[PDB]
């Protein structure tokens, strides 16, 4: 043919069939043993998710949400992803004592539902009403950004203690039970308004620790609505929403590590 005879083309096929078969079999074997060394409830390492990220609902083109108030189809892009997240926090979804629970309407302490085991059924998560997110079709003029702290199994987000000075100096300081969030720019031409659980500008500690997808499917993480009703228009405004805490840290490279970078423009 190109290389060999008919008889010799068969022997090379019969070889590479058996050979690659065995190879696939061995490869599969090694994946099996890998899997056998892992837990169903918890990953082997967690140092790479370590300090949690802060993510928002408006799908940022390039960490940016620019649109026109005097246009209908200018914000219809951003409302899609906004609806996508909030559509999940529905009350019809949160039905019966299984698997949901009514918790304190004011921020509370952690809840330990035992260990990362299957020694109980599905661990019961606290309910979250979207009605807690006051003022937020969404904010057609001057947006209503929805913030979220990234889920980490066995993570107990700890707020800073009011020992020395703090940026939002002691204001509404629910020191024991709120992980705070403040948005900033100098360059102060905005209007900060914060909506949460019990009205607080933070994440309530009673939704923690997260027990994982396998032990807590349908679990809901707390949200925080931020509304920028700025008396300004037609310019790029770089606004950083930062979370504060003992377990919360940031990075020069990772610009999402416990913070936002939002480039709002109401170019109407």
């Amino acid at each position: 043919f190109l290389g060999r005879t008919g008889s010799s083309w068969f022997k090379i096929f019969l070889f590479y069939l058996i050979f690659y078969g065995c190879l696939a079999g061995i490869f599969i074997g090694t994946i099996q043993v890998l899997l056998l060394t892992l837990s169903d409830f918890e990953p082997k390492y967690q140092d790479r998710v370590a300090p949690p990220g802060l993510s928002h609902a408006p799908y940022a083109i390039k960490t940016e949400i620019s649109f026109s108030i005097s246009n209908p189809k200018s914000y219809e892009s951003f409302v899609k992803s906004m609806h996508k997240l909030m559509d999940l926090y529905n009350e019809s979804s949160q039905a019966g004592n299984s698997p949901f629970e009514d918790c304190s309407d004011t921020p509370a302490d952690y809840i330990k539902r035992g260990d990362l085991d299957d020694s109980q059924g599905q661990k019961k998560a606290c309910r979250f009403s979207r009605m807690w997110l006051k003022n937020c079709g969404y904010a057609e003029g001057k947006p209503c950004v929805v913030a979220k702290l990234n889920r980490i199994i066995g993570f107990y987000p700890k707020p800073l203690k009011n020992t020395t000075d703090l940026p939002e100096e002691l204001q509404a300081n629910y020191n024991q039970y709120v992980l705070p969030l403040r948005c900033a720019a100098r360059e102060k031409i905005g209007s900060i308004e914060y909506f949460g659980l019990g009205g607080y500008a933070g994440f309530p500690l009673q939704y923690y620790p997260y027990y994982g997808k396998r032990l807590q499917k349908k679990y809901l993480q707390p949200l925080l609505a931020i509304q920028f009703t700025n008396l300004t228009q037609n310019m790029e405004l770089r606004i950083e929403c930062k979370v504060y805490g003992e377990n919360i840290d940031y990075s020069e490279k990772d610009r999402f590590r416990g913070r936002f970078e939002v480039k709002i423009e109401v170019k109407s």
């Binding site: 390492y45 967690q46 140092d47 998710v49 370590a50 300090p51 952690y110 330990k112 980490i152 066995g154 993570f155 107990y156 700890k158 377990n247």
Partner: protein, 39 residues
């Protein structure tokens, strides 16, 4: 621990780097020893 389980999200990448660089150096020296057994 219970609420104080911060160690679970920590890894000592500093020591690892120190140890790794030690090993790298030593393996490098060993190589020279073996190579220079006659030039």
């Amino acid at each position: 621990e219970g609420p104080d389980n911060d160690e679970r999200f920590t890894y000592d990448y500093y020591r690892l780097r120190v140890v790794g660089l030690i090993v790298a150096a030593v393996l490098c020296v060993i190589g020279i020893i073996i190579l220079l057994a006659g030039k």
